[PDB]
Swiss-Prot record, chain A:
Self-assembles to form an icosahedral capsid with a T=16 symmetry, about 200 nm in diameter, and consisting of 150 hexons and 12 pentons (total of 162 capsomers). Hexons form the edges and faces of the capsid and are each composed of six MCP molecules. In contrast, one penton is found at each of the 12 vertices. Eleven of the pentons are MCP pentamers, while the last vertex is occupied by the portal complex. The lineage of its organism: Viruses, Duplodnaviria, Heunggongvirae, Peploviricota, Herviviricetes. The chain holds residues 1298 to 1344 of 1345 of the full protein. Disulfide bonds: none annotated. Transmembrane segments: none annotated. This is Major capsid protein.
Length: 47, 48, 48
């Protein structure tokens, strides 16, 4: 299956929503945020 | 006009070990020091 | 030449819980540490 853009909390999710970087996966101390593998939101925004 | 079925997986409650823990993007976010922020218990993600 | 009526809504006084509190844009602003900054009581928005 595929990984999708999830995060540990709204803290990491807000910076993801700011920078738009849903591909690169990034980790805080014990909080993690997983990068999405297909930018389907950008796909729908392009059509 | 045919349909796909893409299957997604995602974790919750994964305890990253503090013993080798770290953080990038320290400049972007800063948590408020509470153990509910210091352990993942929930997962937030966007809908459709 | 016709008219619209769009309807707007906006909160005030929402106590965001401190226990999972956080902040982005930590480098941009820095509030002066007083409880009238540390609680929302008012809401600010632009006119026409």
């Amino acid at each position: 299956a595929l990984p999708l853009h999830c995060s540990s909390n709204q803290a990491l999710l807000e910076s993801r929503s700011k920078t738009g970087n849903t591909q690169i996966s990034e980790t805080h101390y014990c909080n993690y945020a997983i990068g999405e593998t297909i930018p389907l939101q950008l796909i729908i925004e392009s059509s | 006009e045919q349909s796909l079925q893409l299957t997604f997986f995602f974790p919750l409650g994964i305890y990253i070990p503090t013993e080798t823990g770290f953080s990038t993007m320290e400049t972007r976010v800063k948590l408020n020091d509470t153990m509910e922020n210091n352990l993942p218990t929930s997962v937030f993600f966007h809908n459709k």
